[PDB]
Design a binder for these strands. Structure first.
Length: 580
DNA sequence: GCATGATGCT
DNA sequence: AGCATCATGC
């Protein structure tokens, strides 16, 4: 039974009411400089569909869009906001975003369209986007009658679902999390994505050139050591040359066939000169394929800029994800990949890259939530946490902790974070489980408060059905009651870890909001470019560096008040590579 | 078209 | 942990 609506030929005053559900449809997944396919407005006066060419050319409609006092409820308003920024139009007054409300209520649902969110409340009078647009190749905008009905039905759902969603968010004590955190953050992310990051493609093209040289050299060497040419990129052909032709030991297998996993080849290293070349070849290869060739594909030729899209409603912990390209995983660990960061430059002459990062925010958050005296005292002293952990679990003085001891205490801290899995520890430390488990027990002896928190949180997750973060983000853990050891075990590790990774996500999001408010009050030209989980990257005139050196760390450190201090380090330079 | 398995980051 | 991407290959 079709839904009633006016298929408008011109904008009317009726369509410019004080409150409305608004749909500004951008069908391309990547909404940067993309077409707006149609518009729908549902308010107390009715339902309307507007062709974009006419409404976006109407001064009253554009003014209504930018009027902060004209409240709009939408689904993924960041997508619309950015598609409109590319058209020189400002979107304001978005007081409710259904995608974000759904995400906060339950991130595991995987809500990615209005139909998915509506189903959460037994509302199914709207179709899934995939159903009307199709998938991949066959994707396509349908004819106006079909298109117009779909947009109006989506707008009507938002109009109807706003109250029940806000009601549940309030019961969950998540209303402010939505209104004061995620929604204001959405607008900040829109500015970042729209601004983009400048790329020195000539540099990138020079690197790919040398990398192509190296690659070819290591690849030929590998054919020598193997005695024949094969597809090094095929773990299949790889596994046969290593474990059959060269008879290397099988220390590990995969579902079917052999495992050429990274650390397996690490173990194999000692036996053959070919293993080191395959690992090096894999390193240069990832650099070439993903970070030179892949990057170059998404750079806009007109501006030499790259515009990521931050998925704000995907992760189970409250973290953001980044795509097309992923700017949260640019190489930094090994020096050869790190050089890729030389290609990321300021978008204006005489401007520089400024990067600030939290120092151990997770362990600091853990010290705070577990209220572990030893852990809190360690951060209050701003101690090297890995040396301090080594001192404690190995029972030696700072003087006697050796590099191998620190590396292992560091391994327990890296693991500790993510629910401290001893099976995974043992593999990381390449030790037996009984030994890994021994490390863990010595940790809990030294950090009793952390032990108690892990126990208490697992009990809570069981009792309530979910765990929450500092700012009330929530994660349901149905598997924590499983009678299957493994399944139940993972959920218990999520119960321990989510409040840690999730609260750190909360903290840095609030810092971003606080920072932009300060940057504006100061009328600084400096602005955010990226966020990579525990660090913020900006660019600004070289003349603003000194003010930034003082402003950025302070805002980040003061975003929330914990039982221990928050510490932020920062650097700046002429390329991302130099902001170190 | 997909998943498998691999590397990259926090 | 759990994100995103890319090459293979069925």
């Amino acid at each position: 039974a079709a839904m009633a609506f006016t298929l408008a030929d011109r904008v009317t005053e009726e369509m410019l009411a004080d409150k409305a559900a608004l749909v500004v449809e951008v069908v391309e997944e990547n909404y940067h400089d993309a077409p707006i396919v149609g518009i729908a407005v549902v308010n107390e006066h009715g339902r309307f569909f507007l062709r974009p060419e006419t409404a976006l050319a109407d001064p009253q409609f554009v003014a209504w869009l930018g009027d902060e006092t004209k409240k709009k409820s939408m689904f993924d308003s960041k997508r619309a906001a950015v598609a409109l920024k590319w058209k020189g139009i400002e979107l304001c007054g978005v007081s409710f975003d259904l995608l974000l409300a759904a995400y906060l209520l339950d991130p595991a649902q995987g809500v990615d369209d209005v139909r998915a969110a509506a189903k959460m409340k037994q509302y199914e009078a709207v179709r899934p986007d995939e159903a009307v647009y199709g998938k991949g190749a066959k994707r396509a905008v349908p004819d106006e009658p079909v298109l117009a009905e779909h947009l109006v039905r989506k707008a009507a759902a938002i109009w109807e679902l706003e109250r029940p969603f806000l009601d549940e968010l309030r019961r969950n004590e998540q209303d402010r999390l939505l209104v004061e955190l995620e929604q204001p953050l959405s607008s900040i992310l829109a500015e970042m994505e729209f601004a983009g990051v400048k790329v020195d493609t000539k540099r990138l093209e020079q690197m790919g050139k040398e990398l192509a040289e190296q690659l070819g050299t290591v690849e030929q060497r590998i054919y020598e050591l193997a005695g024949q040419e094969f597809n090094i990129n095929s773990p299949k052909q790889l596994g046969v040359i290593l474990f059959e032709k060269l008879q290397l030991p099988v220390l590990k297998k995969t579902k079917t066939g052999y495992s050429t996993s990274a650390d397996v080849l690490e173990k194999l290293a000692p036996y053959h000169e070919i293993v080191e070349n395959i690992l090096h070849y894999r390193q240069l290869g990832k650099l070439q394929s993903t970070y030179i060739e892949g990057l170059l594909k998404v750079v806009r030729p007109d501006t030499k800029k790259v515009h990521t899209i931050f998925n704000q409603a995907l992760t189970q912990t409250g973290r953001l994800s980044s795509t097309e390209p992923n700017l949260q995983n640019i190489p930094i660990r090994l020096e050869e990949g790190r050089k890729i960061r030389q290609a990321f430059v300021p978008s204006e002459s005489d401007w520089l890259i400024f990067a600030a990062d939290y120092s151990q925010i997770e362990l600091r958050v853990l010290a705070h939530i577990a209220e572990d005296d030893n852990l809190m005292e360690a951060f209050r002293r701003d101690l090297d946490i890995h040396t301090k952990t080594a001192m404690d679990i190995f029972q030696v003085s700072e003087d006697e902790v050796t590099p191998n001891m620190r590396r292992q205490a560091k391994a327990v801290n890296f693991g500790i974070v993510y629910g401290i899995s001893d099976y995974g520890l043992a593999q990381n430390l390449n030790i037996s489980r009984k030994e890994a488990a021994e490390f863990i027990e010595r940790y809990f002896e030294s950090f009793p408060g952390v032990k108690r928190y892990m126990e208490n949180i697992v009990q809570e997750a069981k009792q309530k059905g979910y765990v929450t973060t500092l700012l009330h983000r929530r994660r349901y853990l149905p598997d924590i009651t499983s009678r299957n050891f493994n399944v139940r075990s993972f959920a218990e590790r999520m119960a321990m870890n989510t409040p840690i990774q999730g609260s750190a996500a909360d903290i840095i999001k609030k810092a971003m909001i606080d920072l932009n408010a300060r940057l504006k009050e100061e009328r600084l030209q400096a602005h955010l470019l990226l966020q990579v989980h525990d660090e913020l990257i900006l660019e600004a005139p070289k003349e603003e560096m000194e003010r930034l050196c003082r402003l950025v760390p302070e805002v980040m450190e003061q975003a929330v008040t914990l039982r221990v201090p928050l510490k932020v380090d920062y650097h700046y330079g002429s390329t991302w590579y130099d902001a170190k």
